[PDB]
């Protein structure tokens, strides 16, 4: 058909990035805004991810740890990745809270 894979793809959510590194995240949102976000598989631990953020003139990164198939992050426990976005846009994360994700 067409291009034909510009159908879809595959609608992973805008944010998430796969098995993204520190140093790549750190590159791409130094030369970001502050609030821009991404998630990415995690560097340490397989099942797990890591949000990765533009904040404070820097770079930061937190875990989502996967605990009973849900998605526990500082001491939160959500049931989705998602949800855990959802709320780091109505609260703060640690400096901001997440204005939009990571182009691709």
Same mark, same amino acid.
């Given at each position: 058909?067409?291009?034909?894979?510009?159908?879809?793809?595959?609608?992973?959510?805008?944010?998430?990035?796969?098995?993204?590194?520190?140093?790549? @995240? %750190?590159?791409?949102?130094? =030369?970001?805004?502050?609030?821009? *976000?991404?998630?990415? !598989?995690?560097?340490?631990?397989?099942?797990?991810?890591?949000?990765?953020?533009?904040?404070?003139?820097?770079?930061?990164?937190?875990?989502?740890? @996967? %605990?009973?198939?849900?998605? =526990?992050?500082?001491?939160?426990? *959500?049931?989705?990745? !998602?949800?855990?976005?959802?709320?780091?846009?109505?609260?703060?994360?640690?400096?901001?809270?997440?204005?939009?994700?990571?182009?691709?």
């Amino acid at each position: 058909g067409s291009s034909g894979s510009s159908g879809m793809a595959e609608a992973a959510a805008p944010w998430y990035h796969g098995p993204l590194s520190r140093t790549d @995240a %750190e590159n791409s949102l130094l =030369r970001m805004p502050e609030g821009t *976000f991404l998630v990415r !598989d995690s560097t340490s631990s397989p099942g797990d991810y890591v949000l990765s953020c533009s904040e404070n003139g820097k770079v930061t990164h937190y875990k989502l740890s @996967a %605990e009973e198939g849900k998605i =526990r992050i500082d001491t939160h426990l *959500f049931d989705n990745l !998602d949800a855990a976005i959802t709320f780091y846009m109505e609260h703060e994360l640690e400096y901001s809270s997440l204005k939009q994700p990571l182009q691709r």
